[PDB]
Write an enzyme that holds these catalytic residues in place. Structure first.
Site, PDB file in Angstrom:
ATOM      1  N   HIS A 165       0.755  -1.256   0.208  1.00  0.00           N
ATOM      2  CA  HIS A 165       0.031  -0.417   0.262  1.00  0.00           C
ATOM      3  C   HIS A 165       1.046   1.087   0.191  1.00  0.00           C
ATOM      4  O   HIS A 165       0.610   2.377   0.046  1.00  0.00           O
ATOM      5  CB  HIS A 165      -1.336  -0.003   1.158  1.00  0.00           C
ATOM      6  CG  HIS A 165      -1.788   0.878   1.510  1.00  0.00           C
ATOM      7  ND1 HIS A 165      -1.502   1.835   2.101  1.00  0.00           N
ATOM      8  CD2 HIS A 165      -2.619   0.998   0.802  1.00  0.00           C
ATOM      9  CE1 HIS A 165      -2.564   3.058   2.077  1.00  0.00           C
ATOM     10  NE2 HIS A 165      -3.340   2.141   1.313  1.00  0.00           N
ATOM     11  N   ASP A 197      -6.298  14.777  -1.000  1.00  0.00           N
ATOM     12  CA  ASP A 197      -4.871  13.979  -1.134  1.00  0.00           C
ATOM     13  C   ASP A 197      -4.119  15.150  -0.955  1.00  0.00           C
ATOM     14  O   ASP A 197      -3.986  15.668  -1.152  1.00  0.00           O
ATOM     15  CB  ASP A 197      -4.531  12.898  -1.404  1.00  0.00           C
ATOM     16  CG  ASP A 197      -4.237  11.678  -0.928  1.00  0.00           C
ATOM     17  OD1 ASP A 197      -3.389  11.566   0.158  1.00  0.00           O
ATOM     18  OD2 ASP A 197      -4.398  10.705  -1.874  1.00  0.00           O
ATOM     19  N   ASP A 464       3.514  -0.515   3.728  1.00  0.00           N
ATOM     20  CA  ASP A 464       3.245   1.003   4.167  1.00  0.00           C
ATOM     21  C   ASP A 464       3.997   1.490   4.587  1.00  0.00           C
ATOM     22  O   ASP A 464       6.067   1.114   4.571  1.00  0.00           O
ATOM     23  CB  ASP A 464       2.114   2.173   4.716  1.00  0.00           C
ATOM     24  CG  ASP A 464       0.422   2.239   4.150  1.00  0.00           C
ATOM     25  OD1 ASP A 464       0.448   2.548   2.876  1.00  0.00           O
ATOM     26  OD2 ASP A 464       0.089   0.853   5.189  1.00  0.00           O
TER      27      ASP A 464
HETATM   28  C1  LIG Z   1      -9.732  -5.606   3.914  1.00  0.00           C
HETATM   29  C2  LIG Z   1      -7.792  -4.947   4.823  1.00  0.00           C
HETATM   30  C3  LIG Z   1      -6.997  -3.416   4.671  1.00  0.00           C
HETATM   31  C4  LIG Z   1      -7.902  -2.749   3.569  1.00  0.00           C
HETATM   32  O1  LIG Z   1      -8.779  -2.637   4.113  1.00  0.00           O
HETATM   33  O2  LIG Z   1      -7.375  -1.646   2.761  1.00  0.00           O
HETATM   34  C5  LIG Z   1      -8.371  -1.266   1.895  1.00  0.00           C
HETATM   35  C6  LIG Z   1      -7.374   0.195   0.735  1.00  0.00           C
HETATM   36  C7  LIG Z   1      -7.924   1.618   0.472  1.00  0.00           C
HETATM   37  O3  LIG Z   1      -6.672   2.097   1.515  1.00  0.00           O
HETATM   38  P1  LIG Z   1      -7.065   3.327   1.538  1.00  0.00           P
HETATM   39  O4  LIG Z   1      -7.164   4.259   0.202  1.00  0.00           O
HETATM   40  O5  LIG Z   1      -7.942   4.250   2.657  1.00  0.00           O
HETATM   41  O6  LIG Z   1      -5.650   4.369   2.101  1.00  0.00           O
HETATM   42  O7  LIG Z   1      -7.415  -0.637  -0.413  1.00  0.00           O
HETATM   43  C8  LIG Z   1      -6.218  -1.956  -0.957  1.00  0.00           C
HETATM   44  O8  LIG Z   1      -5.371  -1.763   0.241  1.00  0.00           O
HETATM   45  C9  LIG Z   1      -7.138  -2.364  -1.531  1.00  0.00           C
HETATM   46  C10 LIG Z   1      -7.841  -2.418  -2.441  1.00  0.00           C
HETATM   47  C11 LIG Z   1      -8.614  -3.388  -3.147  1.00  0.00           C
END
Ligand SMILES: CCCC(=O)OC[C@H](COP(=O)(O)O)OC(=O)CCC
Length: 501
Positions: A165, A197, A464
């Site tokens: 991420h 952002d 991260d």
């Molecule tokens: C499922 C637990 C981890 C999580 O929920 O991760 C959400 C993230 C959103 O991150 P963010 O935009 O809020 O920073 O999206 C992703 O990593 C996957 C997309 C299909």
């Protein structure tokens, strides 16, 4: 100049993850916040860049971000290192990469390029690494022969929901752009309701620290290409996987200073890369009071796993940043709480830290994306709460577990907490009816030290990365350019907790 906030964070990181110092986290001196001439706060890359402009017709912040990305890549002599959540960079983000690489090759260079995306188990990757590589080669034209590509999509744990991420652009181990911004044209560019952002740009030793972090991810990624369920990899020109591109570029010499800014780079390895930092003697007494509103199905890495902390120092870095606040702390996030189940609803130690600050008279501001934002799991600017009460009520709970009685809890909570939904204008919604969505991962304390990066404060077990800066001058810029405007408009969507005037 004294760095009391960084000093406290450094102590926490060396206690949690001593063996990861120099790879997954590192404190460095001598950095520069990379601002253009005549725009001293220009190292702060906000998008769309329309404070007080509900129409947001001229999306000048987005343009400046893409311009800066292109220029940084255009300056590449040796290495370009890119990480993001999937998909691979598209739209104007891809144009920035292509244009920058063509300029680097035209200047006589033969750059090595790594592009890494994390993919959730449920996410279907439309453009896979082989197809993305091929698309880039076509757009690069004759320059493609001089560009060494490594392109890879990865998932480190299916059961424990872990994938990359981090959002990084590192050039020559010398410049770095990081923050919350995914290189996804559908969140920031091709849209009538853009997500709000922020990224930051720096140069100096902390750019090399980011490179070492990406080397850690690519060491795992290159090795686990033996398992296509976990890693899909494509290289160009017959090239090998490059697990240690940043170390090779760094060499033996220490990174050269470019300014006077002290920075802690800090990331985390999620789940499925490394089980523990096994040189760590870290031994916390993990929180005993569990959220009685939800129970996690999966093993709770956020609240109940010593080993996970040792390979995810960013968790404790953010807790110790908040804990370092002596006067006030501002939190600006997509969410403080996660959807539970499958994840824990909140980070207990974070909320306990915040409750302690409220009880001690430290001012706490929390601004999150409006609960009216309901998107798919993994959409930018989504909200994971139905009401801001889910934040204030939880703080009240942790206050009672700390002070003992509810009346003290109320005086701390009602007198010291600001809690609001994000607004960037006097308007509540966008023109097309959609609400404002916030995607920040930002924390600032005492107008002295701040985190900008990809790591959300709500529970998540991803890889991260981010930077913590200590500089009163840079935090004054952050206050002026972002935090004061945010509260100017968001306070119109403030919450009054239950039990308060
Ligand atoms: C499922 C637990 C981890 C999580 O929920 O991760 C959400 C993230 C959103 O991150 P963010 O935009 O809020 O920073 O999206 C992703 O990593 C996957 C997309 C299909």
């Amino acid at each position: 100049p004294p760095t009391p906030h960084l000093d406290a964070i450094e102590r926490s990181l060396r206690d949690t993850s001593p063996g990861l110092e120099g790879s997954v986290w590192q404190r460095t001196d001598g950095n520069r916040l990379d601002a253009p001439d005549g725009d001293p706060a220009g190292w702060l890359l906000q998008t769309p860049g329309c404070w007080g402009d509900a129409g947001c017709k001229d999306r000048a912040g987005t343009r400046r971000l893409l311009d800066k990305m292109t220029r940084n890549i255009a300056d590449a002599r040796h290495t370009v290192d890119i990480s993001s959540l999937a998909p691979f960079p598209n739209g104007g983000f891809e144009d920035a990469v292509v244009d920058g690489l063509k300029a680097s090759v035209a200047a006589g260079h033969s750059p090595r390029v790594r592009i890494l995306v994390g993919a959730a188990p449920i996410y279907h990757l439309n453009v896979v690494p082989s197809r993305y590589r091929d698309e880039l080669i076509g757009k690069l034209g004759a320059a493609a022969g001089k560009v060494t590509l490594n392109v890879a999509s990865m998932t480190t744990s299916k059961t424990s929901l872990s994938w990359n991420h981090s959002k990084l652009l590192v050039v020559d181990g010398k410049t770095a752009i990081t923050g919350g911004i995914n290189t996804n044209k559908d969140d920031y560019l091709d849209t009538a309701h853009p997500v709000s952002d922020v990224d930051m740009a720096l140069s100096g030793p902390a750019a090399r620290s980011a490179g070492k972090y990406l080397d850690t991810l690519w060491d795992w990624t290159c090795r686990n290409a033996s398992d296509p369920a976990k890693v899909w990899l494509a290289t160009s020109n017959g090239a090998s996987c490059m697990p240690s591109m940043e170390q090779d570029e760094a060499g033996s010499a220490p990174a050269e200073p470019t300014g006077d800014v002290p920075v802690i780079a800090v990331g985390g390895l999620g789940v499925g890369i490394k089980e523990s930092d096994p040189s760590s003697g870290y031994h916390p007494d993990l929180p005993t009071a569990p959220d009685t509103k939800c129970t996690v199905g999966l093993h709770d890495n956020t609240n109940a796993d010593r080993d996970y902390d040792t390979v995810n120092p960013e968790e404790n870095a953010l807790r110790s940043l908040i804990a370092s606040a002596r006067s006030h702390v501002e939190i600006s996030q997509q969410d403080l709480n996660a959807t539970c189940p499958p994840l824990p609803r909140y980070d207990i130690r974070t909320y306990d830290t915040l409750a302690g600050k409220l009880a001690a008279g430290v001012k706490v501001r929390i601004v999150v994306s409006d609960p009216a934002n309901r998107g798919a799991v993994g959409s930018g600017g989504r909200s994971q709460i139905k009401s801001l009460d889910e934040i204030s009520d939880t703080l009240r709970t942790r206050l009672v577990a700390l002070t003992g009685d509810n009346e003290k809890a109320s005086r701390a909570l009602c007198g010291n907490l600001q809690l609001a939904s994000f607004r960037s204008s006097d308007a509540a919604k966008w023109a097309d009816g959609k609400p404002y969505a916030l995607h920040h991962k930002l924390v600032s304390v005492d107008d002295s030290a701040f985190y900008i990066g990809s790591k959300n404060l709500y529970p998540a077990w991803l890889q991260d990365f981010g930077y913590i800066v200590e500089s009163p001058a840079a935090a004054q810029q952050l206050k002026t350019e972002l935090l004061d405007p945010e509260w100017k408009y968001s306070q119109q969507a403030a919450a009054t907790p239950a039990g308060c005037p």
